Amino acid sequence: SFDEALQRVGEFGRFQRRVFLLLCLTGVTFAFLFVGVVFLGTQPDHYWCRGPSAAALAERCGWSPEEEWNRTAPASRGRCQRYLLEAPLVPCRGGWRYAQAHSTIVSEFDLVCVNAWMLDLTQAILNLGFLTGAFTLGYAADRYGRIVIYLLSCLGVGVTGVVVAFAPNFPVFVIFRFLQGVFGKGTWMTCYVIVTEIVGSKQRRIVGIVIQMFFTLGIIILPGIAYFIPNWQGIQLAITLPSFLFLLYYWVVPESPRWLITRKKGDKALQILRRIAKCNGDEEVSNPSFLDLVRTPQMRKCTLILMFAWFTSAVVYQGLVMRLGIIGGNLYIDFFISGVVELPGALLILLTIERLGRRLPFAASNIVAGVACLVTAFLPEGIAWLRTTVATLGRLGITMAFEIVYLVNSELYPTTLRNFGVSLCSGLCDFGGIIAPFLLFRLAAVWLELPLIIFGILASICGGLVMLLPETKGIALPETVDDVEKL
């Protein structure tokens, strides 16, 4: 019955186009949130401990900070040792000074030497927050209305961003960044699911891949907003500012029709369909359960393969990032070039899905990335100019795999009884992101260029496995427990 309703009103409309723009703006905001952390708090040029006698001397003679470095520098980067006039001398753990004028997270929180480890621990905590946020917000968003959970998640993102902009100390900052990652994950999941649902099953690939376009576009935009405003709090406030305007949507963006019409209310769905028409014209799901998500062989196998694919994609991308290094000799130029280069791969995704399907591009991209990383592992010493070129095609392949697998993940799961297994799989990807550095170091300890080989076989076997997905095209979206009957 819903199909016919889509035929009478649906597909592409003026209001639907406006809502699509709104939700892809939500996606680009999530892109800023996810990625801006790498830019926040870059390592300063020079940091060092200064003594109380040294501080008095410097303030009396008026040394410039740069000359203070040039004269006071020990050893012969940032030295972890200081001169103690009160000779070779012991390390210092207080009174640090940073020469770089640009404000950074490490300057404020004093993450240097051994303390430099919690700089990466902040990324670890944010990624764990993404994990737990997917894990909880799946159930939270399926329990209540999708749009309601989206709005509360946007409010949470805004409030948490504001509070972390003015966080006084490191522990409160870390816990609030955790509580901000949870809400950002909620926003991204709800927004993508609702924008995918509101569109009919003809240009659904277009809507998904174009909101991915907007995520990449946000990655592209990030260097500009990062470079124009120096102050760290400035970047954080700028990143979290759109969340409030997005809270402001409210009545403009309606609830997704299909989720509403599950025998629960019915009349409200008819009213909202009449509203969107304008002049152009079972047991209640209750709450999801993990056993039901794992129940039945087809559902179990699809879920496990999807989690494996997410994990492999995350770990291979993390492994390849270190080998990519710096391109062009400047961070801004490198980041901008990578962001721009992302786009042609995504347009290729669009056209190749349009011609035949999704599973073949998925497998091809995964195999391409695996072969690229394996070749980088086995390359003979030399080709320094060509060192950059390799492992870049692999990165494009991994990003393509991310986009295709995320769209397929949205497509496969039954919307009415969705536990946000999309969110749970993304959380398993997040878990892979957390453990990736430790596993990478452990593998690299025994022999160098070993982790690249391991990830090459992992990506190859993932590309072999992903062929097993059904990948039915034009079947619209499964309802309730009908997911089994596509096969």
Ligand X SMILES: CC[n+]1c(Cc2ccc3ccccc3[n+]2CC)ccc2ccccc21
> Which residue stretch of 59-67, 211-219, 283-291, 479-487 sits at the interface with ligand X (rule: CB under 6 A)?
211-219
Task: Please tell me the count of residues contacting ligand X according to CB under 6 A.
Answer: 13
Our finding on whether 104 is near ligand X (CB under 6 A) is no
Q: Is 310 in the site for ligand X (CB under 6 A)?
A: no
- Tell me the C-alpha distance between 264 and 283, whole Å: 9
Near ligand X by CB under 6 A: residue from 69, 109, 192, 215: 215
Q: Determine, following the binding rule CB under 6 A, whether residue 318 of this chain makes contact with ligand X.
A: yes
Which of 314, 363, 405, 443 touches ligand X (CB under 6 A)?
314
The residues near 284 (Cβ < 8 Å, ≥ 6 apart) are 262, 263, 264
Count Cβ atoms below 10 Å from residue 300 Cβ, excluding itself.
12
CB of 95 to ligand X, least distance (A): 33
Nearer to ligand X, 257 or 432 (CB): 432
DSSP 8-state symbol, 42: P
* Non-local CB neighbours of 193 within 8 Å, separated by 6+ positions: 141, 146, 256, 410, 415, 418, 420, 422
The residue number whose beta carbon is nearest to ligand X equals: 317
Give the integer Cα–Cα distance in Å for 289 and 66: 61
Going from the C-alpha of 270 to that of each of 195, 213, 260, the distances in angstroms are 19, 33, 10
Examine residue 433 and tell whether it contacts ligand X (CB under 6 A): yes
Report d(CA 133, CA 104) in Å as an integer. 27
Long-range contacts of 263-272 (CB under 8 A, 24+ apart): none
Residue among 196, 338, 376, 399 that touches ligand X (CB under 6 A) = 399
Is residue 435 at the binding interface for ligand X, with CB under 6 A as the rule?
A: no
Asked if 185 and 326 touch (Cβ cutoff 8 Å), the reply is: no
Q: Which stretch binds ligand X (CB under 6 A): 10-18, 230-238, 398-406, 465-473?
A: 398-406
Task: Name the residue among 155, 389, 164, 146 with its Cα closest to residue 257.
Answer: 146
> Residue from 317, 335, 362, 431 that binds ligand X (CB under 6 A)?
317
240 touching ligand X, by CB under 6 A: no
Query: What distance in Å separates the CA atoms of residue 177 and residue 161, rounded to the nearest whole number?
Result: 8
What three-state secondary structure class fits 327? coil
C-beta of 96 vs 406, nearer to ligand X: 406
With contact defined as beta carbons under 8 Å apart, do 224 and 340 qualify? no
- Cβ 216 to ligand X shortest distance, Å: 5
Q: Return the number of the residue (212 or 243) whose C-beta is nearest ligand X.
A: 212
What 8-state DSSP symbol labels residue 301? H
Nearer to ligand X, 69 or 402 (CB): 402
Choose between 247 and 436: whose C-beta lies nearer to ligand X. Answer: 436
CB closer to ligand X out of 30 and 96: 30
Nearest approach in angstroms of CB 395 to ligand X is 9
Q: Which of 107, 122, 160, 216 binds ligand X (CB under 6 A)?
A: 216
Q: Interface with ligand X by CB under 6 A: which residues?
A: 34-35, 212, 215-216, 314, 317-318, 321, 399, 402-403, 433
